[PDB]
Structures are given as C-alpha cells and as structure tokens.
Amino acid sequence: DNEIDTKCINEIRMLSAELPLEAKSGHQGAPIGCAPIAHILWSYVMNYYNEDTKWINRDRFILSNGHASALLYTMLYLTEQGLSMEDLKSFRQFGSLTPGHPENHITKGVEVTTGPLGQGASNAVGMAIAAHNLADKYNTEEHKIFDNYVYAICGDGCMQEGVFCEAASLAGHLGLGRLILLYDDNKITIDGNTDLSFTENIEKKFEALNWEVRRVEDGNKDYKKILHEIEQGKKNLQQPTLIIVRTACGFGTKVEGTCKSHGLALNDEDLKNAKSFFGLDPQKKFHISDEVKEFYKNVIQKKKENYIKWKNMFDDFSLKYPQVSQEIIRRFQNDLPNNWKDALPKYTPKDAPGATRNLSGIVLNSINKIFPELIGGSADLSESNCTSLKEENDIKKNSYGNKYIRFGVREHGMVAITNGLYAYGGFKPYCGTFLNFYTYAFGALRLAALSNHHILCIATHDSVELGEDGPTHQPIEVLSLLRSTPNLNIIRPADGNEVSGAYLSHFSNPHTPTVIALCRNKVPHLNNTQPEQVLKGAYILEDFDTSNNPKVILTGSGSELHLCFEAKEILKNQHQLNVRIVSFPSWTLFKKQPEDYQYSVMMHNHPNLPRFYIEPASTHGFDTYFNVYIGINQFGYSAPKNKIWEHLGFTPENIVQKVLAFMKNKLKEN
Amino acid sequence: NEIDTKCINEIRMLSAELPLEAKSGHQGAPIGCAPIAHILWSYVMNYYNEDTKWINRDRFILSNGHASALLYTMLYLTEQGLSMEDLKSFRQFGSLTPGHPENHITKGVEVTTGPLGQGASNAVGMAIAAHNLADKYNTEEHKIFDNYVYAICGDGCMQEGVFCEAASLAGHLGLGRLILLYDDNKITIDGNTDLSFTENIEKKFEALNWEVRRVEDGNKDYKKILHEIEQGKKNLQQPTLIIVRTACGFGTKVEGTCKSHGLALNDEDLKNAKSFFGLDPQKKFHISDEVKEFYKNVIQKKKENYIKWKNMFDDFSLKYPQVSQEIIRRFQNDLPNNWKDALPKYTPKDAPGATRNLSGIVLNSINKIFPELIGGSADLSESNCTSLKEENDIKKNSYGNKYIRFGVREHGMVAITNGLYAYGGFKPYCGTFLNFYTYAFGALRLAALSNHHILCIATHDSVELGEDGPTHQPIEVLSLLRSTPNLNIIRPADGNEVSGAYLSHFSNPHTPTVIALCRNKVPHLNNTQPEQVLKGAYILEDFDTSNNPKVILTGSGSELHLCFEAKEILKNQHQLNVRIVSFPSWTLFKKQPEDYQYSVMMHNHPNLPRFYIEPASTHGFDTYFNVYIGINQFGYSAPKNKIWEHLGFTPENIVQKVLAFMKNKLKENLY
C-alpha cells in the first residue's frame, strides 16, 4: 500500500461532503461511501482525455445513484475536466455548473442526466451496446479505434427499479461484457435499513440474468480489491459484470451506517471530527493537499499519453481508410448523410390509401439505406409498429455490428437504452411501441427531453381508431401529456407527405426527442400536404375561396383530417359556407412559431369565426385555438373502429352538425 | 376417466372460436392454457358462482389479458354471469366480453388487464390483503379469511419492470397465499423468446425468495398441474411460481409458431383441430352434455363449500358481533360513523404549515378510525409524511398491520395498491414525489379505468421543492392528470383544503385521487372550506359593491397566498375590485354544471382580467383565464426563492401582468 491512495480517498470524502454542507442541501453519505471506487476509477481504471470530454474512444462513466453528485463533481475538479473550486462551492445554486443531480446538458464530463433512480444504470446498457457495435463495425487487426468500456455506479434504489430490471435482463441476454457496474451495497435507503423492503439474493439473481458477479467485502478500505475485480471483469467480454462493493454510508463519520447518513446530517463540527479521524487538517475547508494535487496531475498526464497513442493510431487508420474515417467523423459530429432528404418519399392524392404506420415503415427503410448510424427497434411489436428493417440483422451475443434491437416486452428499459445509445455519440436511435404504452416509459422519455437526447419514438395505434383491443390500449391523455412536456415534439401526420415531414422535422431539430403518432388503418393521401410545412406544426391545406359566404375553419390531424375534407364538401355544397382546412400535425412545433404566423393560420383572434377541431383525445387545451370541437373525454371501447367513431361522433355528418349549431347560435346572439 | 381431457379440449375450442367470430383477437394462449384453467376452476379454486363478491373467495387474475377468451369461457361454464350470446359478442360494442378483461364491465373479472405485468402485480397486493385479513380476524375455530390468489401470466409479464418490482416485494414479504402459473411457451409477438429473453427464471425467482415448481408437459399433464398447485399452497412462507411449459396453439396448424399468438385459425383450421381433439367438427360454439354435466357438478361442489363457510360465519357473528359488523362494513365500502369529525379545521390565526405535513396530520387522524386504511410510501415515508404513528410494518410472519414499506418501486407500488383495493375490504393509499408518479402511470391509469378507489399522496409537487432540481420538479404532470378520465387531481392551498381533499377522496368512491402537496410552509388562508373543495373551484373573497374595475385572481397550492398579497397591492395602490378564487381541482370543477363554472371564473367575459398562476405547463389555461403565469420549461437546482424570483412567482409580478393586461384592454376598447 502507498499512503497517497488513502490520502487521496480521504480528501475526496471530505471535499465531497463539504459541498452539501455549503449549500445546506444535499447528500453526504454515498459520496463518502463511494470515494474509494471513484479514486480507483479515475486514477487507475478509466481511459479518458481531460482536454476532450467528447473523445470518441473515452470510457464513459455514469453515476446512476445521482444524489451522490458531489462525488462526481469532486472527481471532475481533480481531473481538470471543466469544474473549478468556485463551481464546487456553487453546488445546488441558481445557474451553477454543479446542480444537485447531474445534468449532461449543463456540465462537461457528465454523460447522462441522473437523479431518477435506475435510469443511469439502464442508460449504461445502451452505451455498452454502442461500444460493442462500433468495435465490431470499425476495428481492424491493427487499429482498435473503438475499444472502450462503460463504468457505472449505482445504489440499492437503482437495483429495485423496474427500468433497470428490464435493462439488466437485456444486458445479460446480449452478453455486454464491456459494461462494468459497481453496486454500492451499503444496506441503507431513505426509510432505513434495506431489510425493511429489499432482501433479494442479488448475486444469484444477476447470475440468473447471465451477468458475471464479483464482490468486494471491504469497500471502505480495500481499494486494491476494487481495482482487481474491475480488471478481472473487463477480461470477461461475454458477460456484463456486477461488482457488489460493501460500503458504509457516511464511513468514518458520526452518522456512519444510519439512514440519516443518506442526506445532510454532518455539520461543520462533524466534518472537523471526520477530518481528524482521517488524518487531515480539521481547520482547512475545501482543501486538497499538494501531494493529492500532484498525484492527480500525474494521472491527467498519463491519460493524455494514452490519448496520444490512440490519436496517432487513428491518424494512421485515416490515411489507410479515408472513407471509413470520414464516416466516423461525420457520425460523431452529428452531421447527416449527404442528400439525406432525397430518401423521404413523396405522394399525391392519386396514390393508393395507406396507414400512416405502414408509410412510416417505408420511410424508415428508405433512410436506413443511407444512415449507417440508424439503430433501434420495437418492444416486441416490430410488425405492428412497422419498425422492421428489411435486410438488416438483430444485434445479438457475438454479433454486435448490426442495426436492429429486439427489446422484448420492456418499454421503459427500451427508452432508457435508446437514451444511452444517443448519449454515447455517433448514433441516431429510434424505438417503438403502441402510443398508450409509452407511459410505461415516461420516466426515461421525460429525461430525453431534459437531456436534449435526439431520439425518435415511433408510436403506432395512437387512438380509439385501433378498434377491438379496447380501452386499455387506446390513449386519451397521452397527446396532452406530450404537449405539456418541455423540449419534446409530438407529431401526428395525416398522410404520406406528412409522414415524410415528420421524419424531416425530427432530423431538423437535433436537440429534441420526437414522438411520431401513427394510425392503424388506411387513410387517403390528401390535397396540398407538404413535408416542409410539417416543420411549422400547422399550415393551411385549402384556404378560403373568394365568395361572400360565411367563413368556417376546420382543423384536424392524423386519421381524422380526411373527415374534415368530407365535412367541407357538405358544408360548401349543402350549406353554402366558405371553408378553410388546416392541417395540425404538431402542437409543439406550432407553438415555436411567431404569434403572427399562428393567428394567420387559426385566426383565433376572431371570437365569432367558427374554428373547429377534431381529435380522438382529451379536450384539455383545445380552447387556445378553437371554439367548437369534437374530442374524447372518456375511456374507449373494445369494438370495431367504425362502431366507436359512429358512437362518439367522429363522422362528417357530426362535424357538420356541430359547426352549424355553433353558427346558428352565434348569428342569433349577433 | 376421459372427462377431464374432454373438458379441456372443449374449452380449447370454444375459446378459439370467440376471436374467429370477432375476426379479431388471440387464439393461441387460450388454447395453450386451457388445461390450467380446467384444473383451477374444477378442482383448485374455492368460489361461489352465485356471489362473485364472496369475501372469502379465491381471487383469480389473468395477467396475460390477451387470453381473455379463455377467462370468458370459464365464467360461462361456471355460470358466473356470461351467456353463450355474450361469448358470441366478444370484442363487440357494449358487450360483456371485451378483448381484454375489464373488472368494471364483467362479473368475476377482478382487475383490468391487457397492459402486461399489471395483473401479476395486482395479485401481489391481493395476496397482502389475504394474509392481512387472516391474521387480523381469524380465530382458532373460525377461519373467516382463508383464501389464495391465483394468477396466470405469460412471457411478457415476466419481462415487465412493474412485475419485477412486485415480485421482489412478494418474496420479501413471504406471501405464500400467492400462486402464479407461468405459461412458458417460448413465444412472444416478435417470435421465439430467444430473440430477447433468455433468463434462468427458476434461479431468478429463487433469488427473490419464491418457491419454484415446474410442469414439463403442460399440454397434457393436467394431474401434475393440479399436484404442483396443491403442493405450492402448503408452503405458506413463500409465493409459488409454477413454470408450465405449453405449446401456444397446441394441437392446431399454428402450434408453436409466433403466428399462433393472434388470430391464425379459420373455420377449416378449427374443424381440423376439433377432429384432432376428438370433437364433432360440425358443431360450433358447442359444449357437450357430458361437459355441461361435469361443470354443473363443479358448481354444486363449490356451493357446498360456501354453505359450510356461511354457517361458520353465522356462528362467528353471534359470538363476536362487533367484529362481524366491522367486516361487513369494510366489504360494503361503508365509512365509519362520524368519520368527518376526524378532519381537522384551521383559521388564518393558526401557524403556517406545509401541506405535506398537514396531510400527515389528517392521515394519522383518519388512521385511528379507519381499520381498513392500508398503505405506505416508496422509500419516502418521512418526506411524503405518510408514516402512521404507533402502527407497525407489514412483514413476513406479521401481516395484520397497516403500513407497507414499498421500497424504491413506484410502479409496483401503484399496481399493488390497485390489487389491495380490488380485493375488497380496504381503503389503500400510496406515496411518492409527484414527479415520480410517471414511473407508475401504467398502473395509475388503470386505477382510473378500473374505478379503483386508491389514494395517491404526491408531495414535492413543483419547483417550490428547490435544490433537488429539474429531474424532480414536475412541469407536465398536473396536465397529464387533468387529461385522464375518472381521476381526481387536487392541489390544496392550506390546512382547510387538505381536509377538503381527503373529504373529496372519500366522497367519490369510484375514482382514484392524487393529492399534490408542497414542501415548505404556507399560510392558512381566509375563507377556505373543506366542503367547497368538492366543487373544485370556489370564491374565497368576492367583489365589493363599488364601480371600480374588476379583476379575478385564481391560484392553488403553494401559490394561492401570492394572490392575496397581489390583491392588497391592486386594491390599495390601484383601487381595483378584486375577487380571489381557490382552484384546488380542475377535475372536480369540470364535473360541475357550466352555470356554476361561469359564476366562479366569469370566463364568458372577454375583457375581464382573469388571472391564474401555477408552476406548471400553461396547456389548458386558456379555458378559464386570459392572463397567467406558468412554467413552460424545465426547472432549476436552486433555492425555492431564487426560482420564484427568476420565473416571476411574486406578488409584484402578478400585479404587473394584470395591470399590463388591463391597460392594453382599455386601449383596444377605446378604438
């Protein structure tokens, strides 16, 4: 043993613990407990380059137990990856680079946003898929361009969440040996001892999932064993490795091993006492000794030396294989393939009707041919979701350089893995399930929006239009949910041109996740639909004529917009009205537009103008743009689509009656 | 004998005919699981066909809900309220036989399934109830509650996180009254399970502290199915998983292919299958006299067992009348006498309190008079304020308690809470931070669809929670809940409204309630009233009789007190006539007559300033309001006061927005 390692570990414990104390808010116990793991990971195990936190061959790190953020920030400070001491002292303060739970959009060296338990460890499964795939796709005998590992720390909370139960099952099924998960086995959660609620035999469970399991019995002091088990885990490339590290929460302090150690239970005096216990100066606050600084300066230098060897190898590879090097650079710069928009199909009303889910499958297969970086799949609904890619193969154990993932019945794990694939870099991932079952996964979908992860969510069977599977499958509240979530696009295309526009919208908004809502049965290709105009959220398909007849606006989207065209025929020829038709594929994209544009389309500054909307979902929000509408403020039915639409008034005849009734009443009041 | 095989095969074939008639649905699992079903209803399960709400019945759950045609066939054969004409109306509008089972529609359907993983997780809650009631009420001579929970699930349920969570809790609590039969058929929709699902299930469930049993030939070895179920029942210290290997679509042309999952057998195919199984291929929707006679005898034997129980319960009720009356009251869903006396009352003279703490006071008050109150928090008992003083945890070998430590398992917690309600006899509650109910929305939405009367305590409801930051601060959740049918979301502003929110929950017994509660202290407000919370919005201070220009300020939760501070400025510095409206619940308000809604909000007046403040998405606000402060972005890791200052949650910013709206309206009207 060299005392410098123990000195580093103990100064990391106390600096980390000081951040919540300064903020009077946050968690000290796990940062103290996990300091040995962190010292080992950053000083000996992980390969990174402090001057380029986006190095394409870095080992990615994820703190799944995100409440331990003070530990991560201490490590990013010590390894000079972009945090100053003043940043550390700004822990949990407005606008700081050190929020109470790590956010990848705020802080360099933070790969994903954690805090909601189970997400980070599931994200890491997706990064391990990426690491295996790219090694298989690009490495040669002499050039190991991608040879990196995914390291994560988690606690008991992540081990209980279903999202990580799902992701861990897939990780074992796929044999992702590049994943190393260190579990802080400290017998503590917020309510108290884990014995209150959590007594699984974790080792036996993870062996049943096809993980390799290793153990460190004294994770507070045996940092050489932590290093040894990590190094041995890396040698087993056919199984993800779980390392169960036994620690004491708040080790060495007054609150050690009690559930109060979870949070902020060490004041100034308690930290002085802990510093004395650990052999440090109790009078120096926010202090790193010269010897520890010198140690981490040397760590940084050794990391850079390893980076320079890779860089020289990459330059040699790039001379020998220029077109492959060009592809790698393009993918990791998030640049899109040359002439990619030529892959988006175009249609006219003379083409045969098609379901928008099927039209989406045509687009997916078209762009798959020119996007080497496209990756994803369905949660056991590949045919119904139309996500299958012709002539591609499944990612499977010992065959990672493929594009299609069989997620199985794991919506939440799916989306978190999809998040991890995007966050790794170099990928444009997509996922699929029925729209109604994305709420199984909203924990991870909300994080895509907060994290700016550019993921594509194919969501078919978007309404009661799906028919006999019934109310447990028919969304009512989901469109409203998505429209109420910041930085998320929900697009509900009406026909083939608009499906192409929905994919165009996704790739034109590269910091925002997209959900494309798609219908089950065929709908007609409509007059004047335009892919580029989907980007504006709403646009006019047929404007007012030049007559002096009373004016009406009909608006719709998805599988009901064609009903507005049918209603227009009746209103025009049977009731002598002047009807505008507006397509409303995306509320979120529309809200981005200047108000002058929004009023030019919806004319919602006119109180007496009939402004109609139809949508098979909750009417929450409709009063913003509309003053007469048909929605669904109830659960659905197990019945054929036509019977549901008849019962709920999704017919041209009912649109007509609603508009006429609004107008007759308006005229009488006028 | 041959009768059991004949019963099984007629069940296979009648079940397979319902989707064919509807030209929609799933034939393979109903065929594959028919032997399990025959054994469960004919030999294992104790029920009473004339009372599907018998309090000591064995509850059954079909977790692989796409197999609904099988369940309906059994409810028909055991005469539990479905006719042949109902079976022929499978998946038709208004029928009692929807494509996935719905407890609100069909007698003998205990929970609503179809979303995978839910039913098996509900069954864990049902097993908690069965263990709890046995411990609470049984005596040496009177086994009032001695029943078991039976469930069938497929591969999909075994992959879903909600059931991974619930199964972990089931093993931790040692719920030996739970028996789960797993249809291990190597098939899901995409194809072979080896595409995505290769766990060693037996070893995994042993690690979760389940007992695991197996039936290697679940297509034909029905005696072994019966044997393993009966042995599973004898181990009361562990839930039992029975891994039943079947062939999806066994005996038919699609046997063992993923095409068998859905609708892949036509009229000719079913004739061929009937010949394979020794049945008359020319008779459709047919049960033979021999099979009808067999199930008539089953029903009579179940009734004999019920009469024995009823006689014992009558003897118990004479010896312990007060206890018997409590059991009856709980299972009737009736509330204790004078229960509303448990709801505290406050005035503006009382000291400020956080609404989460005030909720904790109400919970402990009603706990004293509600023996049927049960629940807990997902590892946030202190922060959610859900702890019950002087109550004990439910734990292995100690089930007659009221508090559940759910651990870090929000989705499993809500599904278990659903199961506790669906069992009968309970008023369950659960708790987590509001932002983490979207982890559990699969189950929460089903509470609404199923009419499960569950209470969801949801604290830390906004950016007001402060430094934990944007991963913890809801923006979209209030809107989601307001957009969900048959669900109440209530955000009480102070102590009186917290009592009103509990009043609202127990006054609306077929609707789940989410109560959104804040972290820090807020003042008790003028004229708040618990009974008025039932109307969703109501006037706290109404207009005076002056001719000064009118303004309405509306708020809820932790921001309503800001409207009082803004009113003081608008009245004293600007001479305006200001109404204050409390808006604790959009969902309760929407169910009021329009005339009431307009009398409160006055949203038929375009030029009247109608203000609202809420720390969440402005989606929906234009229904009642024309000027407002919301949050259409994610939050911040920062102290609450810093966030409110930055985003304009201040009395002075309310004043500026109202005055700017008014100045502009005057200018437009002068034109």
Ligand SMILES: Cc1ncc(C[n+]2csc(CCOP(=O)(O)OP(=O)(O)O)c2C)c(N)n1
């Ligand atoms: C999904 C979710 N549910 C709940 C919380 C609240 N919470 C934060 S940490 C924690 C559990 C703490 O246990 P563990 O992960 O073992 O951490 P330790 O206290 O040992 O550091 C919980 C429930 C959360 N952050 N995310």
Ligand SMILES: Cc1ncc(C[n+]2csc(CCOP(=O)(O)OP(=O)(O)O)c2C)c(N)n1
């Ligand atoms: C949460 C959820 N996701 C997806 C579906 C769609 N779905 C219905 S059945 C099924 C898989 C069928 O697998 P299994 O449970 O093994 O049933 P089997 O085909 O063997 O009868 C899926 C994905 C669903 N009903 N619920």
Ligand SMILES: [Mg+2]
């Ligand atoms: Mg812990």
Ligand SMILES: [Mg+2]
């Ligand atoms: Mg199966």
